[PDB]
Amino acid sequence: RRFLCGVVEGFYGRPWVMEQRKELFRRLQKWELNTYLYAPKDDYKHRMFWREMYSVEEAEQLMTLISAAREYEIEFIYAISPGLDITFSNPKEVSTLKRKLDQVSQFGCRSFALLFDDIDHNMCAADKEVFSSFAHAQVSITNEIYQYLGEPETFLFCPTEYCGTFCYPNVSQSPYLRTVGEKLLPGIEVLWTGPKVVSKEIPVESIEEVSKIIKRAPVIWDNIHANDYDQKRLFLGPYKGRSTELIPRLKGVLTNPNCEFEANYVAIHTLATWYKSNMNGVLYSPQMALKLALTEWLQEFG
Amino acid sequence: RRFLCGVVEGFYGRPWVMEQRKELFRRLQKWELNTYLYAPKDDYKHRMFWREMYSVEEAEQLMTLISAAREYEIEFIYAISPGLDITFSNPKEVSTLKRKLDQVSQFGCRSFALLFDDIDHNMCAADKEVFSSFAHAQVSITNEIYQYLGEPETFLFCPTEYCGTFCYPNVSQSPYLRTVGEKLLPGIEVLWTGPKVVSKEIPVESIEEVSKIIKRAPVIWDNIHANDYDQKRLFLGPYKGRSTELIPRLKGVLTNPNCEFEANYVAIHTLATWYKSNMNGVRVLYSPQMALKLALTEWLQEFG
Amino acid sequence: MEKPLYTAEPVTLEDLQLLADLFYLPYEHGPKGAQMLREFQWLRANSSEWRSRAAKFEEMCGLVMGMFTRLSNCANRTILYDMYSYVWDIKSIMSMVKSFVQWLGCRRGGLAGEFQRLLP
Amino acid sequence: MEKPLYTAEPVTLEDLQLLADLFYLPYEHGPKGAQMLREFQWLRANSIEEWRSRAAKFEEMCGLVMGMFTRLSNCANRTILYDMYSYVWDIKSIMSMVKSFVQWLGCRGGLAGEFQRLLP
């Protein structure tokens, strides 16, 4: 069974450096985790300036980074966020998108993700004509790139309505998700942050609710340990509020942790413990997982 | 006359990396400042483990740093804090300090600092026999090291009573400072932080007061922009509360600024504006508000 | 007619002057900061001219937020990354302080901060 | 007799347990943290012999927070320390002030902090 469990670097702030990312891979390997989602918000070329191309300096780095992902048996996913200034209709746009992903495929990356997180809900007049609803514009360009890349095994999609609070009128009645669930190809996976952006709890019932509308089990983008929104608070708590009952009902869990890389041990270690506790569809105690992780972490301090 | 003006990297926390330190020297130069006191609390080999020598890798790092300092006409002053576990009377200890400071000269360093800040006043038995007071113990080893190295031009000393509120019973009546003033060698400079550790103002009156009991003009270790004590606070304000009149009455001012390197533009800029305002001054000339607008105008060019 | 390309407003001197007032000195607040604080203290001590000053305070808050944005979009990430925590933090406290004002004219910080509050 | 050498005590599992409990989760405090918060609120509400013992246990627990800081700062792994240093240093400070306060009961944060004090 294919469950994507790992870390997402998708925070606002100073991004992680080569050797940190390398260390993260060593860790994820040792803890039997398997994925890594490359979405650092600093990266202009992943978000703001998506149309732009990586330099030779940049190219060599990403190659070296992807080479370490393979080296440590970690799946590397390259995310791209174009929904800021993209003209969905115009084919030069769609052409440049393909050119970028081509360059990324040259680096040794096969798995991708198209993020439409935190972007303006209203379309420009050019796109407005061509597409029925904002969802139709996103789903069109997604399916296009997915098939263009030879329908890859790992292809994620981040909806604009990526959590429960953001749903208009609510999850079950959202015509946006209804559109995606009906029109997005089944080979593509959908990202979900749960009832909220930083969900305290992710109830099983809530995951059945959203699964029915997206017509698939989602991949959880988990913001539980995220601290970009309050860099005056650190989270050394155990992964908590997610039932092991969720595992057979999900395609994966990618944790968006604290900005401070070293402060993420307990988050990832406890995610691994949570995952391994019910790998196959009370098994997990946050309090116990914490002691487990701190006992292991203690060695690093010497 | 010679005046030490610059930055003292002497804070608790993540130290400045090489590219940053090289950049500081470039900025200090452009702004016509001349010193950099190396006292980062993370360098274990400078403080807690003063005895231990720099490894090959470390030794290389220091050389490049010391070289960069000379390359930008900045005086590099190496600081050493042995006051934690030192036995002043034991000569094996005094030999270790000589041995440690030597390795540092071979990197290119010609300037030195011996700090006795934030340490235990109560001596060991060995030292209680040989030395009549803690003040006598420090002056002994400082004077000794000053002559060993070949009476260098730039030799600084930080006393245990380094601010007004640390003296017992007071600045003027201190038996500690009395011993320092009287016994410490003439060529050795004394570090003072003003009325308090982080002084709001550093009045002339208090500088005259401390100068008498130390029988010389001090070199100010300024903690005005330091933020290690509350890193939920950053200081972008201009250098303020120190009269331009202090310049003819001091041997220097070395600012200990925010841990965060890039946030020290105004701090070092306004300090330079201040120094240069009464450089040639013998014994108003500086507006903090104006000094700020100057700094902010210059800094803005670094954002695009 | 199409979607316009991404452009960002540069950091201005008026922003740096505001930034330095918010993060001034150990014993003193900057004029702009000491002021905003007095105005919020004042609007809270009142419940019903008030709306005349409240509209100005909401613009002042807006300036701190505008300032954060331009600072975050700026070319020099290095300068911003060294102050992101402080800058991001004041923008967040202002946003909710602003919101609280709009609520008055229509009728976090962790564990250390909680112990901080429990003292005089 | 010569001055004793400096030999740093290492980080214990109990230190990390306290650390994790002081910096827990977005919507929850760590068992220890919440307990220290309940203990302070009770000790403040009074001025029996049950107080002299509860204030003793609390000041001892504030000791542990300083203890944990001291040990974390002397550890060999600088990297881990510096990624957290601010947060850990702050709570130790606030804890040192809170420790003195409960001793005396038996006899900061800048501008963002200030605005946060005037909000409900």
mmCIF file of C-alpha atoms in Angstrom, chain C residues 111 115, chain D residues 18 21-22 29-43 54 57-58 61-62 64:
data_model
loop_
_atom_site.group_PDB
_atom_site.id
_atom_site.type_symbol
_atom_site.label_atom_id
_atom_site.label_comp_id
_atom_site.label_asym_id
_atom_site.label_seq_id
_atom_site.Cartn_x
_atom_site.Cartn_y
_atom_site.Cartn_z
ATOM 1 C CA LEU C 111 3.770 30.452 28.149
ATOM 2 C CA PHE C 115 3.630 34.400 33.272
ATOM 3 C CA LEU D 18 10.496 20.038 30.954
ATOM 4 C CA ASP D 21 6.209 20.721 28.265
ATOM 5 C CA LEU D 22 7.134 24.452 28.275
ATOM 6 C CA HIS D 29 0.161 23.612 27.291
ATOM 7 C CA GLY D 30 2.404 20.815 28.435
ATOM 8 C CA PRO D 31 1.316 18.978 31.632
ATOM 9 C CA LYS D 32 4.229 20.585 33.697
ATOM 10 C CA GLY D 33 3.663 24.057 32.194
ATOM 11 C CA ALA D 34 -0.116 24.106 32.892
ATOM 12 C CA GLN D 35 0.657 22.762 36.467
ATOM 13 C CA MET D 36 3.199 25.631 37.019
ATOM 14 C CA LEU D 37 0.577 28.033 35.774
ATOM 15 C CA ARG D 38 -2.079 26.606 38.201
ATOM 16 C CA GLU D 39 0.456 26.678 41.096
ATOM 17 C CA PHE D 40 1.354 30.359 40.491
ATOM 18 C CA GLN D 41 -2.287 31.492 40.336
ATOM 19 C CA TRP D 42 -2.994 29.721 43.732
ATOM 20 C CA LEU D 43 0.147 31.081 45.477
ATOM 21 C CA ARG D 54 3.818 24.839 47.867
ATOM 22 C CA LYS D 57 8.038 23.205 45.461
ATOM 23 C CA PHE D 58 7.298 26.002 42.913
ATOM 24 C CA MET D 61 10.550 23.971 39.827
ATOM 25 C CA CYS D 62 11.643 27.417 38.672
ATOM 26 C CA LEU D 64 14.773 23.240 37.269
#
